[PDB]
Amino acid sequence: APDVQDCPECTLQENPFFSQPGAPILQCMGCCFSRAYPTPLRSKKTMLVQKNVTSESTCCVAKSYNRVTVMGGFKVENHTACHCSTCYYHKS
């Protein structure tokens, strides 16, 4: 159908790697579509404020992780929840 599709969407890329007995692990990965011309859409209307910036923009930082430290002591913060927002004032 589609002839053009950008990268995935901001969210968890459920780890089919670290997948656990009840959780396919994760690693919030996507691209919070926030440009000067959002897709046609047909829902938004409430508050919501947009003012992205050049180079590096809003992102999702697992609201709540279930960290399932894997290989090499990795950490998919078994993302139980992810919230898209700023990334220059936390986790640094």
Short mmCIF file of N, CA, C and O in Angstrom, two decimals:
data_model
loop_
_atom_site.label_atom_id
_atom_site.label_comp_id
_atom_site.label_asym_id
_atom_site.label_seq_id
_atom_site.Cartn_x
_atom_site.Cartn_y
_atom_site.Cartn_z
N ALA A 1 0.84 -1.22 0.00
CA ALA A 1 0.00 0.00 0.00
C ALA A 1 0.87 1.26 0.00
O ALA A 1 0.92 1.99 -0.99
N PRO A 2 1.56 1.51 1.12
CA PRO A 2 2.43 2.68 1.26
C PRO A 2 3.66 2.61 0.36
O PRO A 2 4.20 1.53 0.12
N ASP A 3 4.09 3.77 -0.13
CA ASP A 3 5.26 3.84 -1.00
C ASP A 3 6.39 4.61 -0.33
O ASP A 3 7.47 4.79 -0.90
N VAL A 4 6.15 5.06 0.90
CA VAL A 4 7.14 5.81 1.66
C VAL A 4 6.81 5.79 3.15
O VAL A 4 5.75 6.24 3.56
N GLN A 5 7.73 5.26 3.95
CA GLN A 5 7.53 5.18 5.39
C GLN A 5 8.82 5.49 6.14
O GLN A 5 9.86 4.87 5.90
N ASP A 6 8.75 6.46 7.06
CA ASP A 6 9.91 6.85 7.85
C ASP A 6 10.21 5.81 8.92
O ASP A 6 9.51 4.80 9.04
N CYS A 7 11.26 6.05 9.70
CA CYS A 7 11.66 5.13 10.76
C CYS A 7 10.48 4.79 11.66
O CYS A 7 9.42 5.41 11.57
N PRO A 8 10.66 3.80 12.55
CA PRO A 8 9.61 3.38 13.48
C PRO A 8 9.00 4.55 14.26
O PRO A 8 9.22 5.71 13.91
N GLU A 9 8.24 4.23 15.30
CA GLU A 9 7.60 5.26 16.11
C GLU A 9 8.03 5.15 17.57
O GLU A 9 8.13 4.05 18.12
N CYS A 10 8.29 6.30 18.18
CA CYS A 10 8.72 6.35 19.58
C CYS A 10 7.97 5.32 20.42
O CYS A 10 6.74 5.38 20.55
N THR A 11 8.71 4.40 21.01
CA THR A 11 8.13 3.36 21.85
C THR A 11 9.17 2.30 22.18
O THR A 11 10.36 2.49 21.93
N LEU A 12 8.71 1.19 22.74
CA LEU A 12 9.61 0.11 23.10
C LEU A 12 9.73 -0.90 21.98
O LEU A 12 8.73 -1.35 21.42
N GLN A 13 10.95 -1.27 21.68
CA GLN A 13 11.21 -2.24 20.64
C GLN A 13 11.33 -3.62 21.23
O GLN A 13 12.24 -4.38 20.91
N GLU A 14 10.40 -3.90 22.11
CA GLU A 14 10.34 -5.17 22.82
C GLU A 14 11.44 -6.10 22.35
O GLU A 14 11.49 -6.48 21.18
N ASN A 15 12.32 -6.41 23.26
CA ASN A 15 13.47 -7.25 22.98
C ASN A 15 13.12 -8.71 22.78
O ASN A 15 12.97 -9.46 23.75
N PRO A 16 13.05 -9.16 21.52
CA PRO A 16 12.80 -10.57 21.22
C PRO A 16 14.06 -11.35 21.51
O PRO A 16 14.14 -12.56 21.31
N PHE A 17 15.04 -10.61 22.00
CA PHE A 17 16.35 -11.12 22.35
C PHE A 17 16.38 -11.51 23.82
O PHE A 17 16.61 -12.67 24.17
N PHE A 18 16.17 -10.52 24.66
CA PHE A 18 16.18 -10.71 26.10
C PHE A 18 14.85 -11.29 26.59
O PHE A 18 14.73 -11.69 27.75
N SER A 19 13.87 -11.34 25.69
CA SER A 19 12.55 -11.87 26.00
C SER A 19 12.60 -12.82 27.19
O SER A 19 13.37 -13.78 27.21
N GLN A 20 11.78 -12.53 28.19
CA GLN A 20 11.72 -13.34 29.40
C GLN A 20 10.37 -14.03 29.51
O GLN A 20 9.40 -13.65 28.84
N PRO A 21 10.27 -15.06 30.37
CA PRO A 21 9.03 -15.80 30.59
C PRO A 21 7.90 -14.89 31.06
O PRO A 21 7.46 -14.97 32.21
N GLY A 22 7.45 -14.02 30.17
CA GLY A 22 6.38 -13.09 30.50
C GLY A 22 6.71 -11.66 30.10
O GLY A 22 6.03 -10.73 30.53
N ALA A 23 7.74 -11.49 29.28
CA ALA A 23 8.15 -10.17 28.83
C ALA A 23 9.23 -10.26 27.78
O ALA A 23 10.32 -10.77 28.02
N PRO A 24 8.92 -9.75 26.59
CA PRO A 24 9.83 -9.75 25.46
C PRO A 24 10.85 -8.62 25.53
O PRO A 24 11.29 -8.11 24.50
N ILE A 25 11.21 -8.26 26.75
CA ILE A 25 12.18 -7.20 26.99
C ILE A 25 12.03 -6.05 26.02
O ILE A 25 11.13 -6.06 25.19
N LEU A 26 12.86 -5.01 26.17
CA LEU A 26 12.71 -3.83 25.32
C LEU A 26 13.92 -2.95 25.22
O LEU A 26 15.04 -3.32 25.56
N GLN A 27 13.63 -1.76 24.74
CA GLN A 27 14.62 -0.72 24.56
C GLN A 27 14.02 0.43 23.76
O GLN A 27 14.30 0.59 22.57
N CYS A 28 13.18 1.21 24.43
CA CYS A 28 12.51 2.35 23.81
C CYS A 28 13.26 2.82 22.57
O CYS A 28 14.35 3.38 22.67
N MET A 29 12.68 2.60 21.39
CA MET A 29 13.31 3.02 20.15
C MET A 29 12.28 3.44 19.11
O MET A 29 11.33 2.71 18.82
N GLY A 30 12.49 4.62 18.54
CA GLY A 30 11.58 5.13 17.53
C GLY A 30 11.94 6.54 17.10
O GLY A 30 13.11 6.94 17.16
N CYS A 31 10.94 7.31 16.68
CA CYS A 31 11.16 8.69 16.25
C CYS A 31 9.90 9.53 16.45
O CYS A 31 9.08 9.66 15.54
N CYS A 32 9.76 10.10 17.64
CA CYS A 32 8.60 10.93 17.95
C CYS A 32 8.38 11.98 16.86
O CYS A 32 9.01 13.04 16.86
N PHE A 33 7.47 11.68 15.94
CA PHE A 33 7.17 12.59 14.84
C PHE A 33 6.78 13.97 15.36
O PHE A 33 5.65 14.19 15.78
N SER A 34 7.74 14.89 15.33
CA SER A 34 7.51 16.25 15.80
C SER A 34 8.15 17.26 14.86
O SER A 34 9.21 17.82 15.16
N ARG A 35 7.51 17.50 13.72
CA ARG A 35 8.02 18.44 12.73
C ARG A 35 7.14 19.68 12.65
O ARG A 35 6.22 19.85 13.45
N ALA A 36 7.42 20.53 11.67
CA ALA A 36 6.64 21.75 11.47
C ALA A 36 5.41 21.47 10.62
O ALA A 36 4.77 22.39 10.12
N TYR A 37 5.09 20.19 10.47
CA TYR A 37 3.93 19.77 9.68
C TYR A 37 3.58 18.31 9.95
O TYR A 37 3.92 17.43 9.17
N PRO A 38 2.90 18.05 11.08
CA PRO A 38 2.50 16.69 11.47
C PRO A 38 1.54 16.05 10.46
O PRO A 38 0.83 16.75 9.73
N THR A 39 1.54 14.72 10.42
CA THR A 39 0.68 13.98 9.50
C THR A 39 -0.77 14.45 9.60
O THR A 39 -1.17 15.04 10.61
N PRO A 40 -1.57 14.19 8.56
CA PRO A 40 -2.98 14.57 8.52
C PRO A 40 -3.63 14.51 9.90
O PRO A 40 -4.33 15.43 10.31
N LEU A 41 -3.40 13.40 10.60
CA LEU A 41 -3.97 13.21 11.93
C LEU A 41 -5.48 13.41 11.91
O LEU A 41 -6.07 13.66 10.86
N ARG A 42 -6.10 13.31 13.08
CA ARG A 42 -7.54 13.48 13.20
C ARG A 42 -8.02 13.14 14.60
O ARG A 42 -9.00 12.42 14.78
N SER A 43 -7.33 13.68 15.60
CA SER A 43 -7.68 13.43 17.00
C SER A 43 -7.24 14.59 17.88
O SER A 43 -8.07 15.23 18.54
N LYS A 44 -5.94 14.87 17.90
CA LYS A 44 -5.40 15.95 18.71
C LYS A 44 -6.34 17.16 18.71
O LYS A 44 -6.98 17.46 17.71
N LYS A 45 -6.41 17.84 19.85
CA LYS A 45 -7.26 19.01 19.99
C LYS A 45 -7.11 19.63 21.38
O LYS A 45 -7.19 20.85 21.54
N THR A 46 -6.88 18.79 22.38
CA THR A 46 -6.70 19.26 23.75
C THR A 46 -5.51 20.20 23.85
O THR A 46 -5.13 20.84 22.86
N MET A 47 -4.91 20.28 25.03
CA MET A 47 -3.75 21.15 25.24
C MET A 47 -2.65 20.81 24.25
O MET A 47 -2.77 21.08 23.06
N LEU A 48 -1.57 20.21 24.75
CA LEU A 48 -0.45 19.82 23.89
C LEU A 48 0.33 21.04 23.41
O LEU A 48 -0.25 21.98 22.86
N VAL A 49 1.64 21.02 23.62
CA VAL A 49 2.50 22.11 23.19
C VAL A 49 3.68 21.59 22.37
O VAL A 49 4.36 20.65 22.78
N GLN A 50 3.91 22.20 21.21
CA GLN A 50 5.00 21.79 20.33
C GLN A 50 5.99 22.93 20.11
O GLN A 50 5.59 24.04 19.75
N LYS A 51 7.27 22.65 20.31
CA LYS A 51 8.32 23.64 20.12
C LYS A 51 9.69 22.97 20.01
O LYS A 51 10.67 23.44 20.58
N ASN A 52 9.74 21.86 19.28
CA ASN A 52 10.98 21.12 19.10
C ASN A 52 12.13 22.05 18.74
O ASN A 52 11.93 23.25 18.55
N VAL A 53 13.32 21.49 18.63
CA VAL A 53 14.50 22.27 18.29
C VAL A 53 15.36 21.54 17.26
O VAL A 53 15.10 20.38 16.92
N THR A 54 16.38 22.23 16.76
CA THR A 54 17.28 21.65 15.77
C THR A 54 18.24 20.66 16.41
O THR A 54 18.68 20.85 17.55
N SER A 55 18.57 19.60 15.68
CA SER A 55 19.48 18.57 16.18
C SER A 55 19.01 18.04 17.53
O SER A 55 18.97 18.78 18.52
N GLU A 56 18.68 16.75 17.58
CA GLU A 56 18.22 16.13 18.81
C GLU A 56 16.94 16.80 19.31
O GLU A 56 16.94 17.98 19.64
N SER A 57 15.86 16.03 19.35
CA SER A 57 14.57 16.55 19.80
C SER A 57 13.93 15.62 20.83
O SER A 57 14.55 14.65 21.27
N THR A 58 12.69 15.92 21.19
CA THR A 58 11.96 15.11 22.16
C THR A 58 12.28 13.62 21.99
O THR A 58 12.63 13.18 20.90
N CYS A 59 12.14 12.87 23.08
CA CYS A 59 12.40 11.44 23.06
C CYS A 59 11.64 10.74 24.18
O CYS A 59 11.14 11.39 25.09
N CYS A 60 11.57 9.42 24.11
CA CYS A 60 10.86 8.65 25.13
C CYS A 60 11.84 7.95 26.07
O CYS A 60 12.70 7.18 25.64
N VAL A 61 11.70 8.23 27.37
CA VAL A 61 12.55 7.64 28.39
C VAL A 61 11.72 6.77 29.32
O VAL A 61 11.17 7.25 30.31
N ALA A 62 11.61 5.48 28.99
CA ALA A 62 10.82 4.53 29.78
C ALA A 62 10.34 5.13 31.10
O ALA A 62 11.12 5.33 32.03
N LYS A 63 9.04 5.39 31.17
CA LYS A 63 8.42 5.94 32.36
C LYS A 63 8.68 5.02 33.54
O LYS A 63 8.83 5.47 34.68
N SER A 64 8.74 3.74 33.24
CA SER A 64 8.98 2.73 34.25
C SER A 64 9.63 1.51 33.62
O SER A 64 9.08 0.91 32.70
N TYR A 65 10.81 1.17 34.10
CA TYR A 65 11.55 0.04 33.56
C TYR A 65 11.37 -1.21 34.40
O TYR A 65 11.09 -1.13 35.60
N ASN A 66 11.59 -2.37 33.79
CA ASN A 66 11.52 -3.62 34.52
C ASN A 66 12.85 -4.31 34.36
O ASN A 66 12.99 -5.53 34.45
N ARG A 67 13.81 -3.45 34.09
CA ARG A 67 15.19 -3.81 33.86
C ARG A 67 15.41 -5.31 33.98
O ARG A 67 15.18 -5.92 35.02
N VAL A 68 15.88 -5.87 32.88
CA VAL A 68 16.17 -7.29 32.79
C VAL A 68 17.60 -7.48 32.36
O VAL A 68 17.89 -8.24 31.43
N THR A 69 18.49 -6.76 33.03
CA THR A 69 19.91 -6.80 32.72
C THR A 69 20.27 -8.07 31.96
O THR A 69 20.10 -9.18 32.46
N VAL A 70 20.76 -7.88 30.75
CA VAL A 70 21.15 -8.99 29.89
C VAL A 70 22.62 -8.93 29.53
O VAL A 70 23.38 -8.14 30.08
N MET A 71 23.00 -9.80 28.60
CA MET A 71 24.37 -9.90 28.12
C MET A 71 25.23 -8.72 28.55
O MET A 71 24.82 -7.56 28.43
N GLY A 72 26.43 -9.01 29.03
CA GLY A 72 27.34 -7.96 29.45
C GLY A 72 26.73 -7.02 30.47
O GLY A 72 27.15 -5.88 30.60
N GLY A 73 25.73 -7.52 31.19
CA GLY A 73 25.07 -6.70 32.19
C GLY A 73 24.30 -5.55 31.59
O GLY A 73 24.16 -4.49 32.20
N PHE A 74 23.79 -5.75 30.38
CA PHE A 74 23.02 -4.71 29.70
C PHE A 74 21.80 -4.34 30.53
O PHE A 74 21.61 -4.86 31.62
N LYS A 75 20.98 -3.42 30.02
CA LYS A 75 19.80 -2.99 30.75
C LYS A 75 18.73 -2.42 29.83
O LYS A 75 18.79 -1.26 29.43
N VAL A 76 17.73 -3.24 29.53
CA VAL A 76 16.61 -2.83 28.69
C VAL A 76 15.56 -2.19 29.55
O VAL A 76 14.39 -2.08 29.16
N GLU A 77 15.98 -1.80 30.73
CA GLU A 77 15.08 -1.21 31.70
C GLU A 77 13.70 -1.76 31.43
O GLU A 77 12.70 -1.05 31.48
N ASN A 78 13.70 -3.05 31.10
CA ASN A 78 12.50 -3.78 30.73
C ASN A 78 11.34 -2.81 30.67
O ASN A 78 10.35 -2.94 31.38
N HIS A 79 11.53 -1.79 29.85
CA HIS A 79 10.57 -0.72 29.69
C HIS A 79 9.14 -1.18 29.84
O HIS A 79 8.56 -1.80 28.96
N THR A 80 8.60 -0.81 30.98
CA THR A 80 7.22 -1.12 31.30
C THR A 80 6.34 0.03 30.84
O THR A 80 5.13 -0.12 30.66
N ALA A 81 6.97 1.19 30.63
CA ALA A 81 6.28 2.38 30.17
C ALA A 81 7.29 3.38 29.63
O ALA A 81 8.41 3.48 30.13
N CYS A 82 6.90 4.13 28.60
CA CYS A 82 7.79 5.13 28.00
C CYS A 82 7.06 6.44 27.78
O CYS A 82 5.91 6.46 27.33
N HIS A 83 7.72 7.55 28.11
CA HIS A 83 7.13 8.87 27.95
C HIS A 83 8.02 9.76 27.08
O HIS A 83 9.17 10.03 27.42
N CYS A 84 7.47 10.23 25.96
CA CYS A 84 8.22 11.10 25.05
C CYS A 84 8.30 12.52 25.60
O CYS A 84 7.29 13.11 25.98
N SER A 85 9.51 13.06 25.65
CA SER A 85 9.73 14.41 26.16
C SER A 85 11.18 14.83 25.99
O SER A 85 11.91 14.26 25.17
N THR A 86 11.60 15.83 26.76
CA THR A 86 12.97 16.33 26.69
C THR A 86 13.96 15.26 27.13
O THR A 86 13.59 14.30 27.81
N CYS A 87 15.22 15.43 26.75
CA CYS A 87 16.26 14.48 27.11
C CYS A 87 17.54 15.21 27.51
O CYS A 87 18.64 14.66 27.41
N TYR A 88 17.39 16.45 27.94
CA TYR A 88 18.53 17.26 28.35
C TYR A 88 18.34 17.82 29.76
O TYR A 88 18.40 19.03 29.97
N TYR A 89 18.10 16.94 30.72
CA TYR A 89 17.90 17.35 32.10
C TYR A 89 17.55 16.16 32.99
O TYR A 89 16.84 16.30 33.99
N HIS A 90 18.04 14.98 32.62
CA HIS A 90 17.78 13.77 33.39
C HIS A 90 18.44 12.55 32.75
O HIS A 90 18.50 12.44 31.52
N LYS A 91 18.92 11.64 33.58
CA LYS A 91 19.57 10.42 33.10
C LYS A 91 20.98 10.70 32.60
O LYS A 91 21.66 9.81 32.10
N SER A 92 21.43 11.95 32.75
CA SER A 92 22.77 12.33 32.31
C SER A 92 23.77 12.20 33.45
O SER A 92 23.60 11.29 34.29
#
